[PDB]
Design a protein around this ligand. Structure first.
Ligand code: NA
Ligand SMILES: [Zn+2]
Lengths: 181, 46
């Protein structure tokens, strides 16, 4: 999703905003991710405002105290950044790819079913279009955030084609936009 | 609160230390880590 970002040249095509409809943007995140309600007190404390950041191809990122929390494209669903998912790794359901798949996910590639049906992989029930955290085999922290393009049962039986779309991965353009000031 | 959890991010390539191998210069990564965090050096050494 971030191809025009990773040309270095940070703080270039990104506008930040002050006064936002703050609570009007929270109540959608609890419905998207239910297991987060007891943690937005720390993630988005009411003592600190939120500041939206909009860079092009029509993406906006929610930030508090500089740190990048969620992002979305146009009016689509919110995705947590990996830096935040790392702090609270239970935000998303997990899908675990095998060790051999890391270097491919790390280069922006979508996840094929061989990546999820391998012995080193671990696939869990997930409906189509659900946001998942891409864990790797011998690794503790999420490698990627994706969205099921096929159901977990389809990935098993069909066992080829695109299983999970690669939306945001370690060392991509959003990853290197550390914080905005 | 058990979270937010703290992950050690490498200082040369900015990634979690467990993913420094898949990066171009792991030598540099391994250098910085033992100079910075010796305890998880021995962890990644095993
Ligand atoms: Na748009
Ligand atoms: Zn590194």
């Amino acid at each position: 999703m971030f191809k025009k970002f990773d040309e270095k040249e940070n703080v270039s095509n990104c506008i930040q905003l002050k006064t936002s409809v703050i609570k009007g943007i929270k109540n959608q995140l609890i419905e998207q991710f239910p297991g987060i309600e007891p943690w937005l007190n720390q993630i988005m404390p009411k003592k600190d405002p939120v500041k939206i950041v909009r860079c092009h191809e029509h993406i906006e990122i929610l930030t508090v105290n500089g740190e990048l929390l969620f992002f979305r494209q146009r009016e689509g669903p919110f995705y947590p950044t990996l830096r935040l998912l790392h702090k609270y790794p239970f935000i998303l359901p997990h899908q675990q790819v095998d060790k051999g798949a890391i270097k491919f996910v790390l280069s922006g590639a979508n996840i094929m079913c061989p990546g999820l049906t391998s012995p080193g992989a671990k696939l869990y029930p997930a409906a189509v279009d659900t946001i998942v955290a891409i864990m790797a085999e011998g690794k503790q922290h999420a490698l990627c955030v994706g969205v099921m393009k096929m159901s977990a049962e389809d990935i098993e039986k069909v066992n080829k084609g695109i299983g999970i779309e690669n939306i945001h991965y370690l060392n991509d353009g959003l990853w290197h936009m550390k914080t905005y000031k | 609160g058990d979270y937010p959890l703290r992950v050690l991010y490498c200082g040369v390539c900015s990634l979690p230390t467990e993913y420094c191998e898949y990066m171009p210069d792991v030598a540099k990564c391994r250098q910085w880590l033992e100079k910075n965090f010796p305890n998880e050096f021995a962890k990644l050494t095993v």
